[PDB]
Amino acid sequence: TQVCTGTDMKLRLPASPETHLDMLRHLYQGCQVVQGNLELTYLPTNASLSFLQDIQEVQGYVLIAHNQVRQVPLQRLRIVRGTQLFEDNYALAVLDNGDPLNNTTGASPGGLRELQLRSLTEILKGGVLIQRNPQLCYQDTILWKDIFHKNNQLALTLIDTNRSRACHPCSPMCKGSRCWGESSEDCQSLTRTVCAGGCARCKGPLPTDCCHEQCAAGCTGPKHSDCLACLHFNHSGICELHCPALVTYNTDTFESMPNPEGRYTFGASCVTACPYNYLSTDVGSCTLVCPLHNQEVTAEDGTQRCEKCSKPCARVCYGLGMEHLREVRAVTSANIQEFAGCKKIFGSLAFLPESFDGDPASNTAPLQPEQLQVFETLEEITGYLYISAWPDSLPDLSVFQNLQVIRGRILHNGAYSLTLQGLGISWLGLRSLRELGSGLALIHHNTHLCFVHTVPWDQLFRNPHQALLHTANRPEDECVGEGLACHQLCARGHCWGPGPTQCVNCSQFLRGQECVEECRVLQGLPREYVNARHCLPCHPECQPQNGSVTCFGPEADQCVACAHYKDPPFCVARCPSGVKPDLSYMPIWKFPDEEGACQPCPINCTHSCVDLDDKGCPA
Amino acid sequence: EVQLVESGGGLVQPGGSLRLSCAASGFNIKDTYIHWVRQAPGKGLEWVARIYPTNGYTRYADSVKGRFTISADTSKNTAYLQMNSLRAEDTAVYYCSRWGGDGFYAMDYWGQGTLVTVSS
Amino acid sequence: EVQLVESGGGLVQPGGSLRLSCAASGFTFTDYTMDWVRQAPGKGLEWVADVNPNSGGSIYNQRFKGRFTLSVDRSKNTLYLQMNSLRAEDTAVYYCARNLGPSFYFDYWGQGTLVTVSSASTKGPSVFPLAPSSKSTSGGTAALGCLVKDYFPEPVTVSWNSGALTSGVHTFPAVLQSSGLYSLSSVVTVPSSSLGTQTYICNVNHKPSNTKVDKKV
Amino acid sequence: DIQMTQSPSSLSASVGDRVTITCKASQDVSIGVAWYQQKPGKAPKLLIYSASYRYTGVPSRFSGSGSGTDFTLTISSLQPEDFATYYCQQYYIYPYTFGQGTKVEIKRTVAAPSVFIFPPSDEQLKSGTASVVCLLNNFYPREAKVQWKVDNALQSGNSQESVTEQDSKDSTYSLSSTLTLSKADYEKHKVYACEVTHQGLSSPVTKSFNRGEC
Fold it and tell me: Which residues are glycosylated (chain A)?
């Protein structure tokens, strides 16, 4: 997609600094609009970041921190909106880039030399921050009050100039010292200090060089169509103040007709539907969680809806990071009770060391592995799953065997939907898992963990931008040294662990949750019928024949005959005498025929027929 | 007597769907199959489907095999026929009935019925 | 607890106009329709309008067809309402709210703010020391007071003996009386021999005309 | 519009009481009614929706019922914080509408209207704007008539009246009644009077003063 998520990493070090560079090479690959923050952190001088060239707009802020790159490939960035801000104050932050005076000689030790943000035309909220970048030139010769939006001049700025090197002047082809950088490509744009009076925007000094009111990042022609980025919405190349309404009204009655020319609101845009993992809402918002008194429903096209509870809504179970558990860092002895029998979770799940070695001063108990059984009902998670400790008695993640999907609408550090770190364990066992709705999956420092290369990660994602990220685990050469793999019946060798209960799809048949070579149609005593590759008993009257069987479906009339007696149509080991009525007629003393038919008696009581022609009905 | 009540019969397009509904009275569905049956108007009968509401087992006739599905709410004393891929060969007066105790597969309790029609 | 905060209340002359503001606290302004509802002195509630936070598209009561204007400031969790040219028919305390009618019925609310109209200019109080007649003094505890009268607009402030006389003191809500101006009384209950010796003092300020007032009774 | 009236407009209950209020429509609002409280000088809040469903964060004591045109609130046991105004609202027919309001009043024993009368001051004896006053304190319940008389007629419309709203430590009332006249009315009559038609003493505790003998 041309739209991607931003991140939330704000001067935390990477959970794997080694595989951090390639995480960004997936997440931002050819992205044009960032739904979040653009963070560039701890990136070394060798970093081929050229895939960032396509970013046109950021809805959050930009943070470029602690990097040893000489330059940043961001020359296409038109504008930043500041829907979030760094320290609630800043929309562009440049921190601590180069080296902090280590014991290291290298003549180009990184640090950003220049601005080179050659497109940046507007900032709609928040200030600018630059600190401890001793390599940086030209940040001081900028008219930042052209770029700060005229109608929201929250123009705080804190810029460092403590250089440890010289700066020569920018190319004299510029109209004075107004530059991004050193070359004749690198002149600063002006769009507000070359304009006057009613011209809130222009491309030049004339009244014809002015731009339309909806146009933030400048214009080419004078019309609302002619514009390089727009202040409120883009709809189909029209710069609209609002998205078009989804309803038409009577104007007096306010009786309502749906409008097919309506759109939903999503980021900087108006769209006719919400993208795959989001929620559609009655008022036309595309969201992550439903509004209060709206439920997330299983809408027909899979594109979920938030529609209205005409009774009080069902008490769905919150995960960590939502309502009841927003601030709550961990599953513990106290909140594990709140998941008992829950099948969809509204939030995330997290296992830290402190989840299991629970603190007696913050008076919680250490966690028993048996308390984890409360999750075995779980079908779906709206947030993420994070694991950084596990009990040494569990070689696997068995309590999640029934989990189909993790959405990642909430993400760990804004980026990750599944984390499995430092756990030691040998396999995963997640047999039902078939979807990762958004965000990356991280699996690192796991001592014995085999078979992670056998999972068809292809089938779980819904964009070309997500990957599995792995390092410091078990060698897969030492997994063939263990002599084990996925089982013979695992389709293309795809599994979650060792044996017939672990395959992602089965080559032959399913006996309950066992993938098997064949089923007991002929080959044994407990006979099993086939139901579209599943295998099941009847009620036990498919009596073993030498080449056939006796009741196919568990409505016991269906393979060929009966084993001992018939009560038409069904089959039994004895004609029965029930002592509960509903209506005042029990099965009256059903005598066997010679072909075993269980026939009722010909007089109501008193006179004859008790199977032995005796006395066993009352009166 | 013990008795039922049919509902949800009506007029439909061919190829379309209709959901019939049948509630139970004088008993509560646990020793139970619930059936659907239909009459060619003032002529022959045809049996359509059964459900056992106490475990969800279902069976069908060769005319509605792979077209229709029978279903129930075993708490709300009610069973349903989900008819789909409808035909002119479905214009009939529909009826619902019971069995209970398998040695008595004879249909004693029923409701008032409802018409079903399929047309342009 | 979760709640709204209103501003822009005041008074004008007949045919004049004013505007209100409402800011949301404890919840996201972005996900619910927002409302105005008012109490016209001595009644319950009248609905004024609904407005959506996503585009400012809004539905007023027919009492304001072509009269009132709604707007939203989704940049700062806030909304605004413009008023039209009353001769006091639309006099009320106006409250903000947000919606839960799948339709219009409101679950979270604000403290409200005043809009009232009179032809009056700003005026400081006419004053009267509310003695009992000597034909109405008690063989025990009597009452006295001070009337603060024919002033405009609100607020007045009233106290007794520099604020030290709290023992048996009372003050009532103001009446917008038949001259188009405001009045209230403050009163105190005391043993009659102390009233004839330690004769108690009322001490006042009207903030709009800035006039301070004093009296004893 | 559907007019969503309340009743009865004043009713006295104590802390601990089961309490009831009713609500009535001008038209069907069958599952289309909600219920409210508003405390003295505070924001309103929602209590109940679709006649009967209590809302989020609403206290342990609140309930509702009714349908068609006729609706009910009930408080299972009353708190010190319920001495307030109450409403119901409709949400079927535009424009949307409440009613005239109703108070749950604080219940305690009847109390004696302790009453005083002001001949218009020794500084009005100069200034000539005869602003006359009559004063009650210590009375209960809230329900009364006060009004003005001159010689033996009644006078109004140049009159205005105001009261306390209540401290739950006792909650007996004060009232002032005011009458605006001139010095050219002061010489027009002989007697001026104030009617104290309230329950808290076993007679209407009527007050007076003079043109002459004040």
Answer: 46, 102, 162, 234, 505, 546, 604
